[PDB]
Design a protein around this ligand. Structure first.
Ligand SMILES: NC(=O)c1ccc[n+]([C@@H]2O[C@H](COP(=O)([O-])OP(=O)(O)OC[C@H]3O[C@@H](n4cnc5c(N)ncnc54)[C@H](OP(=O)(O)O)[C@@H]3O)[C@@H](O)[C@H]2O)c1
Ligand SMILES: C[C@H]1COc2c1c(Oc1cccc(C#N)c1)cc1nc(N)nc(N)c21
Length: 244
């Protein structure tokens, strides 16, 4: 049987007359000020190997790649897989950014060593560029073999849409819900130009099941309560959905 594909996403609800939309992006970035708890959660979960000596891959659309600040990318300690229709051009630029990243990470390792820090086996950092999502999945399987850890689809909307359309991989969604705190017992809504490709079918569980906190916990390898938690002007909670 074939390994699960996990979409991981943060959404914000936007009630419209016809349905609640799930906003994910505005102007090529996220819709909200930085949420430290979502960031660290995303980082720990996407990095965490499912067994020793493996590295997780994140499959992303080219715009989501670009949405990460250049100095932080490709994102460390994972295999970054950038899906594009211009492999040739994007390859050259990713290769360049990887090389700069390698340079930053090497200097840090040398410094860490130099100040008497304990080093240990950890997941590796790579970036590769593919012509499609299916191509990306193939490409990472072929390059990494049994060193491949968990595969995450990290966005954005076009790539998620493609994941959800793949021919029957179980697909699971690990979702962080983001809401503004009420002001006069009313909650404002974030402006978004990019939305998750499905919304009502998750909130109404049509073809999807919302899973126990214990099940999310197993997927992501750290405790998830499914409780709301306050983070400044937002509250957030983590939930999961499996296709039925
Ligand atoms: N809140 C979250 O959890 C989250 C996560 C990720 C992203 N986002 C947000 O979403 C926005 C970006 O989303 P998006 O939907 O506009 O972009 P996206 O899906 O990240 O990327 C679109 C790009 O991916 C490439 N691509 C897409 N489909 C393809 C296919 N079928 N075959 C080959 N290449 C393909 C194309 O790259 P080329 O143009 O280079 O061909 C396309 O322009 C940003 O605002 C970002 O901040 C939010
Ligand atoms: C990376 C963008 C794209 O996807 C995601 C991103 C993100 O922002 C950043 C920005 C800079 C570094 C890192 C890191 N590491 C994350 C946060 C995310 N949160 C959730 N819950 N889900 C996703 N898919 C996310």
């Amino acid at each position: 049987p074939t390994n699960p594909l996990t979409l991981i996403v943060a959404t914000t609800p936007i009630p419209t007359r016809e349905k609640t939309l799930l906003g994910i992006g505005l102007n090529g970035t996220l819709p909200w000020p930085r949420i430290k708890a979502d960031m660290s959660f995303f980082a720990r979960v996407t990095t965490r190997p499912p067994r020793p000596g493996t590295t997780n891959a994140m499959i992303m659309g080219r715009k989501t790649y670009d949405s990460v600040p250049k100095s932080l990318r490709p994102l460390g300690k994972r295999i970054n897989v950038i899906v594009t229709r211009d492999v040739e051009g994007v390859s050259k630029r990713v290769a360049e950014e990887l090389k700069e990243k390698r340079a930053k990470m090497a200097a840090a390792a040398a410094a860490a060593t130099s100040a008497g820090e304990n080093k240990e086996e950890g997941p590796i950092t790579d970036a590769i560029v593919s012509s499609g999502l299916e191509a990306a999945l193939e490409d990472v399987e072929e390059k990494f073999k049994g060193g491949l850890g968990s595969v995450f689809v990290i966005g954005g909307a076009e790539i998620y849409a493609t994941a959800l359309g793949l021919g029957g991989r179980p697909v699971r969604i690990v979702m962080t819900n983001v809401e503004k705190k009420g002001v006069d017992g009313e909650k404002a809504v974030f402006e978004c130009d990019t939305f998750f490709p499905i919304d009502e079918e998750l909130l109404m569980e049509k073809g999807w099941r919302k899973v126990s906190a214990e099940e999310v916990t197993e997927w992501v390898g750290e405790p998830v309560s499914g409780e709301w938690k306050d983070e400044g002007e937002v509250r957030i909670q983590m939930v999961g959905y499996e296709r039925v």
